[PDB]
Amino acid sequence: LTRSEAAMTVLSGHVVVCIFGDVSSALIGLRNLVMPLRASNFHYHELKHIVFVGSIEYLKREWETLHNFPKVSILPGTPLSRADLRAVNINLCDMCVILSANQNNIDDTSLQDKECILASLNIKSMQFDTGVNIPIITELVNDTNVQFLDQDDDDDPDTELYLTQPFACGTAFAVSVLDSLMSATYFNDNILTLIRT
Amino acid sequence: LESVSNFLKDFLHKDRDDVNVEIVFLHNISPNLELEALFKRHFTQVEFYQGSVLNPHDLARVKIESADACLILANKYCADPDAEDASNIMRVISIKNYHPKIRIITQMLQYHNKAHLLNIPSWNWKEGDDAICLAELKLGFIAQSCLAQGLSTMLANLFSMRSFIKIEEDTWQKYYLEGVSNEMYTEYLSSAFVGLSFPTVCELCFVKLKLLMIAIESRILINPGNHLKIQEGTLGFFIASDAKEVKRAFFYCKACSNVKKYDSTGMFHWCAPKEIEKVI
Amino acid sequence: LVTGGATPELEALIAEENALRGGYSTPQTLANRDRCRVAQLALLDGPFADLGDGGCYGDLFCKALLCFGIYRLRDAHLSTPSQCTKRYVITNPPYEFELVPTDLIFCLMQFD
Ligand SMILES: [Ca+2]
Ligand SMILES: [Ca+2]
Ligand SMILES: [Mg+2]
């Protein structure tokens, strides 16, 4: 889609996926986000539209894995660009997903989450004929940056991830919570098949 | 050492007024013996604490919730401007996350990174959050020197704090140093100047208060002319030898159509997306 | 003074779009062209030239509506000739300042 088509197309109750990446960045495996949203136990009318906002080289590297799915769109552009977010009706989405491919190929230990924090802040700052109520989920790779997603809360570096407000509300996620699955799957021998199902 | 000693020379200058402001440095590396000695020379007005701007405990140790402003200095000579700007972007989101209402002043190297900066929800340039973009101001100084040569020199001299150096030999330097003694200062004006015409106001304080009057201002209007000048709580920008001199601007005693030619605001000329193969 | 258009509206547009979209010259748009520009004027030829040899910085702000400095040749303060064309900047000279006919002056010029 060009900005024009996105702006005149009425998208409502849909999913916006914001991708940071480039030709060098690792594959995220975006089909693992798309497949659950395409399960045959949704009827074709209640099936949520999906739009990717991001670098075109990154999306055309994932495309071979997800070109079989119905109702998917690509807006080639920057997920920090207000004009691109305005064009995809970000105020009418059922979810905005913010995530980065360039998460661990940098050994700076402070740069990875940067653009995701700024994208989360930009959408909540945004105004419509009022953006603070938009449903956002942010992937974080550094555990400690979570307390940077909300401003109306008590931040403390010794508070565990599960107990912090952005996680308790379901607006932040990190792979560090999945470490308990080693132990859970050891004692409950079928439980990985349940969670996968 | 060079950044702190340059900063303290401009900040603690005697051409300013009674600056009681205490300066608190927050840096993750221990100071070397030279920089510890520079802090010993400023024992009553400078304090240093080791810590990280990215840690809310260290921001609490430095009392950011009661600081008048936070100043973020950039490495101008870094190997990669994008990594430096991305690091200074991190600092501002950390400081604003700990306290939304603190005034931040920051250097930025590249202009496209300054656009990312103002997408932070509590960054508010209407209440003094200042991004000093070096690429914008540099290329702008150069650009204004294409209309009038040497303008980039006097603009740079108006923000540097400097006393009047005296030299007796008839040289280009004696007349240059007199000019270098000036800086630009802000002050409020209202008593006996409310409702007067902008030129008259300039004439009075140039002729009898002996200070080079308001270059601008109500809003930020440079040299307005005979119209659009009636405001009671307006501010002026003056050129003067020091901050003690400009103060006499207060308590004035009266004793002695069919095609797109511009952008959507009309601020810049526009034509069309011309093409590279046509301008080559 | 330097960027030529640092106003709240322009800042809002480039923060939204990162680009300039061209627009039509509606009379409120066209009124935004009225802003001062920096310029240098020659003092050896023009309506100021009788001050130019008259030798004193009598500011004349009552005409065309603002001078703020001199661009003086590095070898103008001495009686011997020289081939040097380099000029140094004097910012805010005194009202009584001794000027010479081979001076340029920095000024802000109205739109017309
Ligand atoms: Ca927080
Ligand atoms: Ca001075
Ligand atoms: Mg102290």
Describe the structure.
The structure is cut from a larger assembly and holds three copies of chain A. Chain A is an alpha/beta fold. In chain A, 28% of the residues lie in helices and 16% in strands. The first copy, chain A, contains eight helices and six strands; from the N terminus they run H-E-H-E-H-E-H-E-H-E-H-E-H-H. The first copy, chain A, has a six-stranded parallel beta sheet with strand order 3-2-1-4-5-6, sandwiched between helices. In chain A, strand 4, helix 5 and strand 5 form a beta-alpha-beta unit. The longest helix of chain A is centred in the middle third of the chain and has 12 residues, at 114-125. Chain A is globular, with a radius of gyration of 18 Å. Chains in contact: A-B, A-C, B-C. The A-C interface holds A 81-83, 86 and C 15-18. Strand 8 of chain B pairs antiparallel with strand 1 of chain C. Residues 15, 162-163, 181, 183, 241-242 of chain B line the site of one calcium ion. Magnesium ion binds at residues 22, 47 of chain B. The PDB classes it as membrane protein. Keywords: Potassium ion channel, calcium and voltage gated ion channel, big potassium channel, human BK, hSlo1, open-inactivated hSlo1, ball and chain inactivation, hSlo1 inactivating subunit complex, beta2 beta4, nanodisc, membrane protein. The entry is titled "Ca2+ bound open-inactivated hSlo1 + beta2N-beta4 channel in nanodisc". Chains A, B, C: Isoform 5 of Calcium-activated potassium channel subunit alpha-1. The organism of A, B, C is Homo sapiens.
